[PDB]
Amino acid sequence: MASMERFLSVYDEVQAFLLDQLQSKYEIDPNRARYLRIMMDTTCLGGKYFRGMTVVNVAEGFLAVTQHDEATKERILHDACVGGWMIEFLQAHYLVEDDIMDGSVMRRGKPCWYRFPGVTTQCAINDGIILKSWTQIMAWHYFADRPFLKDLLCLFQKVDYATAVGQMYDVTSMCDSNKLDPEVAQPMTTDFAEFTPAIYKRIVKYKTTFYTYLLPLVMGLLVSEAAASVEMNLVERVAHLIGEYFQVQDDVMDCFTPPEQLGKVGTDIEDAKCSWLAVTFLGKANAAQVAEFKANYGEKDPAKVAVVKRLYSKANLQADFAAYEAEVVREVESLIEQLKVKSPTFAESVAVVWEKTHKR
Amino acid sequence: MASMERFLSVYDEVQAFLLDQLQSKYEIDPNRARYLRIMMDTTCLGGKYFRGMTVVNVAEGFLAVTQHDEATKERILHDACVGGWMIEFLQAHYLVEDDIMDGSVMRRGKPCWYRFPGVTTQCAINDGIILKSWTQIMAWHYFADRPFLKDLLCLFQKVDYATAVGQMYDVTSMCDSNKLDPEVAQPMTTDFAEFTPAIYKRIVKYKTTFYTYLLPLVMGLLVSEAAASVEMNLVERVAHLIGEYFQVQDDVMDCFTPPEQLGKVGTDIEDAKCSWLAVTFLGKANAAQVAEFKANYGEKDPAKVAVVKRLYSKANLQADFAAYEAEVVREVESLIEQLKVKSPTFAESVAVVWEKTHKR
Numbered sequence: 122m123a124s125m126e127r128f129l130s131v132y133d134e135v136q137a138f139l140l141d142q143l144q145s146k147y148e149i150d151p152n153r154a155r156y157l158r159i160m161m162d163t164t165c166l167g168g169k170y171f172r173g174m175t176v177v178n179v180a181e182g183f184l185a186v187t188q189h190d191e192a193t194k195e196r197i198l199h200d201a202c203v204g205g206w207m208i209e210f211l212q213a214h215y216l217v218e219d220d221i222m223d224g225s226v227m228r229r230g231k232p233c234w235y236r237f238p239g240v241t242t243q244c245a246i247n248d249g250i251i252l253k254s255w256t257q258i259m260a261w262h263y264f265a266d267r268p269f270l271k272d273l274l275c276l277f278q279k280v281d282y283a284t285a286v287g288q289m290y291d292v293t294s295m296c297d298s299n300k301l302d303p304e305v306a307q308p309m310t311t312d313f314a315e316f317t318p319a320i321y322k323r324i325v326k327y328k329t330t331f332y333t334y335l336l337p338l339v340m341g342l343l344v345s346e347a348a349a350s351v352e353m354n355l356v357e358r359v360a361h362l363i364g365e366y367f368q369v370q371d372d373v374m375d376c377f378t379p380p381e382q383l384g385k386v387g388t389d390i391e392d393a394k395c396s397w398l399a400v401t402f403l404g405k406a407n408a409a410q411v412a413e414f415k416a417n418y419g420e421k422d423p424a425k426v427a428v429v430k431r432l433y434s435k436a437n438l439q440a441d442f443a444a445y446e447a448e449v450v451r452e453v454e455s456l457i458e459q460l461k462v463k464s465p466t467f468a469e470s471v472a473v474v475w476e477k478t479h480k481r
Numbered sequence: 482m483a484s485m486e487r488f489l490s491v492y493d494e495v496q497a498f499l500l501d502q503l504q505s506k507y508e509i510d511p512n513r514a515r516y517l518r519i520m521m522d523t524t525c526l527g528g529k530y531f532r533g534m535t536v537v538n539v540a541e542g543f544l545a546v547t548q549h550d551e552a553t554k555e556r557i558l559h560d561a562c563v564g565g566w567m568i569e570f571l572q573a574h575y576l577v578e579d580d581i582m583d584g585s586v587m588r589r590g591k592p593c594w595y596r597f598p599g600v601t602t603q604c605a606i607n608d609g610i611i612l613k614s615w616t617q618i619m620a621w622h623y624f625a626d627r628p629f630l631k632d633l634l635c636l637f638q639k640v641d642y643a644t645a646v647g648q649m650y651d652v653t654s655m656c657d658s659n660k661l662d663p664e665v666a667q668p669m670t671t672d673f674a675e676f677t678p679a680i681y682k683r684i685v686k687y688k689t690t691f692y693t694y695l696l697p698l699v700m701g702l703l704v705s706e707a708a709a710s711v712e713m714n715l716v717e718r719v720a721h722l723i724g725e726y727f728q729v730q731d732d733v734m735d736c737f738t739p740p741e742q743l744g745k746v747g748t749d750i751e752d753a754k755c756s757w758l759a760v761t762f763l764g765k766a767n768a769a770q771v772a773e774f775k776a777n778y779g780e781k782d783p784a785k786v787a788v789v790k791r792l793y794s795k796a797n798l799q800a801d802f803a804a805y806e807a808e809v810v811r812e813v814e815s816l817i818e819q820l821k822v823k824s825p826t827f828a829e830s831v832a833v834v835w836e837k838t839h840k841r
């Protein structure tokens with residue numbers, strides 16, 4: 122039994138639990154059960170499952186070094202799978218709602234869930250709500266008698282909140298802070314003064330890193346009852362750093378990876394996003410180049426999108442990416458070394474996370 | 482110190498806690514804090530606060546009969562206020578998202594939050610997410626060391642999920658069940674076969690009654706450590722029944738209360754909602770009347786809305802409302818009598834809830 126095979130098997134089991142519960146306790150009818158099954162599948166499956174499988178991988182590294190009865194090892198792996206699904210369903214929730222919020226068209230060779238003919242925004246907003254409620258139902262059912270229930274729910278809660286805060290930072294990142302005002306329609310910045318490395322960092326740290334790196338790592342510790350094998354400030358530092366590095370590749374790919382090759386036509390430029398490319402370009406451009414950027418950024422007009430795309434090529438942003446990458450490698454290695462002091466095993470799992478981020 | 486005065490004072494305190502936490506732990510800037518303060522105010526204030534004040538009222542009925550130190554009485558009232566705010570913020574969350582989902586224009590003498598100029602749907606979806614995350618932050622902070630933390634979070638979780646399920650039942654109530662299919666755009670029913678008292682009941686029970694009646698009642702018990710003063714199956718039965726009766730008045734008002742007098746132009750007819758009026762009309766109409774209903778319902782065309790409005794008047798729906806009301810009075814009195822066996826005090830609080838629903 123490979124890890125992935127176990128993880129996918131547990132999806133069937135959770136799906137059955139949730140659907141059967143809807144029938145026995147929520148008076149659901151079969152057609153609505155079927156609608157929700159389809160919703161779940163469509164939104165929760167696809168890709169590599171780095172997030173969920175990280176929880177499994179962390180727990181398996183502790184299983185290798187820790188004495189347990191076989192039935193305990195099974196229970197720990199089952200808990201890691203359920204906790205990894207809780208993170209995948211949280212990712213579903215985000216994606217569903219973010220797609221609606223941003224007017225996205227495609228995700229994973231498919232219409233964004235809201236664009237399905239028999240879905241609509243009216244239903245999809247609520248479907249995304251359901252996705253996140255399911256995470257809670259899973260935790261309370263599978264982890265009812267577990268000693269880590271409280272800590273897990275508290276952590277999940279804090280990660281979710283960070284993530285929502287991050288979405289707000291992301292969707293407001295093209296406005297001037299001093300002009301945010303519910304009463305006044307928001308103009309795009311003209312100075313780009315808030316396109317800085319520190320503001321960019323704040324966006325990415327909240328929007329992505331808590332749920333993509335910190336949560337899978339700490340959930341793997343909690344289901345292993347191993348949170349005292351580690352210095353949590355180290356776990357936070359390394360998660361946030363790897364997560365930022367991940368998002369700097371994403372930002373670079375939103376612009377430069379061909380559309381079918383990426384699965385979604387990129388719109389960061391036309392959305393005036395505070396991307397790594399824009400911030401880094403503004404960090405090195407001359408006066409005439411800054412003025413040229415201001416004249417073209419944040420416009421749906423493809424010819425102006427192409428101008429921004431050109432200034433990024435003239436500016437040799439690959440040099441800055443390589444230099445950033447080399448610093449993140451130093452720093453991530455340093456963190457891993459510090460994590461070995463208390464736990465070689467957990468340090469190794471972090472090393473695997475990093476390899477999966479970097480080499481990919 | 483009146484109860485309402487205490488309840489409103491605690492809003493200031495929670496608001497300060499949440500905003501200060503955003504600054505000290507989430508790197509928020511002042512303008513974004515201000516945006517979120519405004520959001521909170523706009524979405525969480527207004528009206529009578531029946532839901533939040535029910536928690537306070539239930540706890541005050543137990544305080545009257547239970548021996549405690551003064552500092553305990555204060556702590557219990559403070560917990561009841563915080564728990565009542567958790568319910569008001571859950572109501573905020575619903576309203577924000579439901580308004581977006583349904584394309585509503587007005588709420589409480591104001592544009593629906595999403596329609597504010599500097600809000601937009603792109604931000605308001607996430608703002609509604611934040612509203613519900615705040616409920617959790619409040620519980621974990623104010624109730625950290627409380628014996629009822631677990632039970633409260635579990636109850637809140639189950640109520641939230643019921644409510645989301647209910648929204649799905651509501652938004653799909655004009656489709657035929659056998660034709661729900663994410664792949665196929667959903668036609669309005671032509672037979673109206675699912676406009677029955679039992680299907681109507683299922684909608685209202687999930688969509689409204691768990692969060693509006695069951696949650697405030699059980700939260701008042703939990704913060705009072707009094708959940709063994711009561712037979713919970715009775716609390717459920719009475720909550721669901723009063724809640725349904727509430728929603729049958731709402732349904733009647735969506736059609737018949739003038740727009741400024743109601744605060745929002747009603748659209749149940751044009752939305753083809755499974756309302757009490759439609760179900761009850763179909764329950765007594767003759768053949769020609771049913772055919773006339775089918776020809777006019779669920780159309781934005783005001784002249785057809787007026788036809789439906791006319792058939793409802795010809796059909797003397799007030800007779801059915803009075804008869805329904807008289808049965809609910811019997812049944813609610815019966816429940817209250819049964820609740821007195823274990824708790825006169827809690828039975829009285831239920832009697833007040835009922836008076837506030839019925840007489841109003």
Ligand SMILES: NC(=O)c1ccc(NC(=O)[C@@H]2CCCO2)cc1
Nearest residue numbers: 164165166216228231232233234
């Ligand atoms: N077409 C869609 O609306 C849609 C496609 C994919 C996702 N999610 C994912 O890609 C990751 C992988 C599993 C968890 O979320 C969500 C929605």
Ligand SMILES: NC(=O)c1ccc(NC(=O)[C@@H]2CCCO2)cc1
Nearest residue numbers: 312313314315316317403404411
């Ligand atoms: N790094 C940045 O995000 C940033 C820094 C400076 C500028 N603009 C200028 O350097 C000139 C001087 C006045 C007008 O534009 C814009 C952005």
Ligand SMILES: NC(=O)c1ccc(NC(=O)[C@@H]2CCCO2)cc1
Nearest residue numbers: 524525526576588591592593594
């Ligand atoms: N204009 C709006 O968008 C808006 C107005 C009112 C509400 N909420 C309420 O009326 C109840 C009362 C407090 C909790 O929810 C939400 C939004």
Ligand SMILES: NC(=O)c1ccc(NC(=O)[C@@H]2CCCO2)cc1
Nearest residue numbers: 672673674675676677763764771
């Ligand atoms: N109570 C209902 O919701 C309901 C029951 C019956 C009908 N239609 C009919 O009675 C005739 C007989 C065949 C065509 O229409 C519609 C609705």
Ligand SMILES: [Zn+2]
Nearest residue numbers: 219222223291
């Ligand atoms: Zn987005």
Ligand SMILES: [Zn+2]
Nearest residue numbers: 579582583651
């Ligand atoms: Zn609605």
